[PDB]
Write a protein that binds this ligand. Structure first.
Ligand SMILES: CCCCCCCC/C=C\CCCCCCCC(=O)O[C@H](COC(=O)CCCCCCCCCCCCCCC)COP(=O)([O-])OCC[N+](C)(C)C
Ligand SMILES: CC(C)CCC[C@@H](C)[C@H]1CC[C@H]2[C@@H]3CC=C4C[C@@H](OC(=O)CCC(=O)O)CC[C@]4(C)[C@H]3CC[C@]12C
Ligand SMILES: CC(C)CCC[C@@H](C)[C@H]1CC[C@H]2[C@@H]3CC=C4C[C@@H](OC(=O)CCC(=O)O)CC[C@]4(C)[C@H]3CC[C@]12C
Ligand SMILES: CC(C)CCC[C@@H](C)[C@H]1CC[C@H]2[C@@H]3CC=C4C[C@@H](OC(=O)CCC(=O)O)CC[C@]4(C)[C@H]3CC[C@]12C
Length: 548
């Protein structure tokens, strides 16, 4: 009883020794080591001793970080410090309690060196123990929440609106009298157009709930047979106003405002947005696909015996190193290109780009490679001329995590030196570390052995951060709304762990098989709760964001 019966048909599909992890690891370490020597001769070029910086890493006290950098660096390092701790608990459960279950699988017991043995693919469908995987996936959601209730637990104008689309010939009298007659419950303190004003204004009220009500009445989605939104109500003042044509917003400070960009609104602005974002999403397909093609040479006609796999130098190391190169350049595209979308507020742009870096990195590292590698008609050709799971059984992901761990972090030292010719980007750095955490979490239950490398991705990213925050990057104060943003991404990670579990369950047993059902039930219950935080606002004691 086996899956491949390698004695009958010596089929190329049965993968490398150890998934090619040993060669990837050996070359990645050796490339890391070489980069640390290269770093040393770089930082010594400009003016205590060769490796002195490596001693500094473990000497600097947390209070020195706190004192020099300010609170944003400590809130950042707290986030890391929690995720490191999170991954020890998830790590010990994965390697301790998931892996010995997987490895008890009867399905890949031939092919003893196959990395596939340490994955869900080793478990025969209908085997009772498959509930343990669904259970841990849920348990990990509770831990990624509880660990973020702890992170957030440790950490620390409101009547003024900015009103846009006023005609340049408008008058403060009419603008003032409008609110106090269209909404007689209000009272107006100030009402001023702003920098021949170009049709933007500040207005200030007496009361905050009234402010929110007035702010809603220009923007709110509620409907009739006539119109899909609450159209802003008429007045005697209206000729100065052009009320229907406004956009109205809580006023940020003028240091946040792009007085250039907000000159365009409605369908035109959504055109510039969609044709920038489509070009980038098209481009991801071509950046992605070389990695998947170079990896997938399990074709036939000739070159069919197991002996015909290439060296894991080309079939594992090279493609994951190329995918890393594109992963590490991707932030530099979206930070550059987001300038041309013309957001209204620098704060928005910063807060947008962190979620855009993250979701493009997710499409091009996790989701499109997951669909690409899952698109193995390969099994259909073997079968016609369950044991379906990724080619190499997902060793590709381990190999990515290793590549990003050793080569990525060693490169992170070198990201700030220079002189080879003869300021902390908090959003980018958040996006990048949650991209990697997402992969680890996604595979942590289908493919346990990824988690140790996930942990050491974090430890080395942490040390290199604690180092380069204190010594290298300029001390920076930041907009708090990105730290709170990043915690939502951490909650996405175990949810995508549940989704791919439902996928690789439902492509290996029916949707009516009870583990498929249970995973669906958990997922649908989880998502309605998570959505009810976003605007509906019912749950605000739960899931995250305990604050001082
Ligand atoms: C979304 C919430 C809207 C809230 C808001 O005010 O809009 C912006 C959300 O920021 C965005 O630009 C959203 C980006 C959407 C990208 C996906 C499309 C491409 C898909 C590819 C397939 C807020 O940012 P802002 O610049 O501060 O406000 C501008 C608001 N206007 C311009 C929309 C009025
Ligand atoms: C296969 C392809 C062609 C379609 C797959 C869908 C994605 C391209 C979509 C689905 C959800 C979208 C995201 C949903 C929400 C946001 C948040 C948005 O930023 C916000 O914070 C909005 C609210 C605010 O700024 O206050 C920026 C765009 C982004 C990342 C979107 C980018 C495009 C995404 C990933
Ligand atoms: C193959 C299956 C999984 C379908 C593909 C689904 C994706 C399009 C989803 C999965 C997870 C989603 C992300 C999970 C979490 C967030 C956080 C969310 O954050 C906020 O809106 C923060 C707002 C604030 O903090 O003020 C922005 C969208 C984003 C990136 C989502 C974008 C759409 C993603 C990539
Ligand atoms: C039929 C329906 C139920 C299918 C749902 C498919 C997608 C639309 C789902 C799958 C995963 C979801 C995400 C999973 C996790 C999160 C984190 C969490 O993010 C926030 O709270 C950000 C917004 C805020 O700051 O208030 C809640 C929304 C979000 C992005 C979800 C948005 C909707 C997503 C993309």
């Amino acid at each position: 009883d086996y899956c491949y019966s390698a004695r009958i048909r010596s089929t190329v599909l049965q993968g490398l020794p150890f998934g090619g992890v040993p060669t990837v690891l050996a070359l990645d370490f050796m490339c890391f080591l070489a980069l640390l020597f290269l770093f040393s001769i770089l930082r010594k070029v400009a003016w205590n001793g060769f490796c002195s910086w490596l001693t500094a890493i473990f000497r600097i006290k947390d209070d020195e970080i706190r004192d020099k950098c300010g609170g944003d660096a400590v809130h950042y390092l707290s986030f890391q410090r929690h995720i490191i701790g999170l991954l020890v608990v998830v790590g010990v459960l994965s390697v301790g309690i998931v892996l010995p279950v997987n490895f008890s699988g009867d399905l890949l017991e031939n092919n003893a060196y196959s990395f596939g043995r340490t994955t869900i693919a080793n478990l025969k469908s209908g085997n009772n123990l498959l509930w343990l995987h669904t259970s841990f996936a849920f348990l990990y959601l509770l831990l990624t929440v509880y660990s973020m209730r702890r992170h957030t637990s440790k950490m620390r104008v409101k009547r003024t609106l900015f009103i846009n689309g006023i005609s340049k010939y408008a008058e403060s009298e009419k603008i003032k009298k409008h609110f106090e007659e269209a909404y007689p419950n209000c009272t107006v303190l100030e009402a001023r157009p702003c920098y021949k004003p170009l049709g933007m204004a500040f207005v200030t009220f007496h009361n905050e709930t009234i402010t929110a009500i007035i702010l809603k009445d220009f923007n709110v989605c509620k409907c009739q047979g006539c119109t899909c939104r609450g159209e802003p109500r008429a007045s005697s003042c209206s000729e100065a106003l052009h009320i229907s044509n406004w956009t109205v917003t809580y006023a940020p400070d003028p240091q946040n405002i792009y007085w250039e960009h907000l000159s365009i609104r409605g369908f035109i602005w959504w055109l510039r947005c969609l044709v920038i974002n489509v070009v980038l999403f098209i481009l991801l397909f071509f950046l992605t696909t070389p990695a998947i093609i170079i990896t997938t040479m399990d074709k036939f006609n000739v070159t069919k015996p197991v002996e015909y796999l290439n060296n894991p130098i080309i079939t594992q190391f090279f493609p994951t190193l190329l995918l890393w190169c594109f992963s590490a350049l991707l932030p530099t595209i979206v930070y550059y290109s987001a300038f041309f979308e013309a957001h209204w507020t620098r704060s928005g742009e910063n807060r947008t780009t962190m979620h855009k870096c993250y979701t493009f990195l997710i499409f091009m590292v996790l989701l499109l490679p997951s669909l690409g590698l899952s698109s193995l008609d390969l099994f259909f050709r073997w079968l016609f001329d369950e044991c379906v799971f990724l080619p190499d059984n997902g060793a590709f992901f381990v190999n990515y995590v290793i590549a990003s761990a050793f080569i990525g972090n060693a490169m992170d030292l070198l990201r700030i030196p220079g002189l080879l010719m003869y300021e902390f980007q908090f959003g980018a750095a958040y996006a990048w570390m949650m991209c990697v955490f997402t992969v680890v979490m996604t595979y942590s239950i289908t493919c346990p052995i990824i988690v140790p490398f996930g942990l050491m991705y974090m430890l080395l990213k942490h040390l290199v951060d604690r180092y380069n925050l204190y010594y290298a990057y300029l001390p920076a104060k930041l907009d708090k709304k990105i730290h709170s943003g990043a915690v939502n991404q951490v909650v996405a990670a175990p949810i995508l762990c549940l989704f791919w579990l439902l996928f690789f369950s439902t492509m290996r047993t029916g949707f009516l098989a009870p583990t498929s059902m249970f995973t669906f039930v958990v997922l649908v219950i989880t998502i309605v709760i998570c959505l009810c935080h976003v605007c509906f606002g019912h749950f605000k004691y739960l899931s995250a964001h305990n604050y001082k």
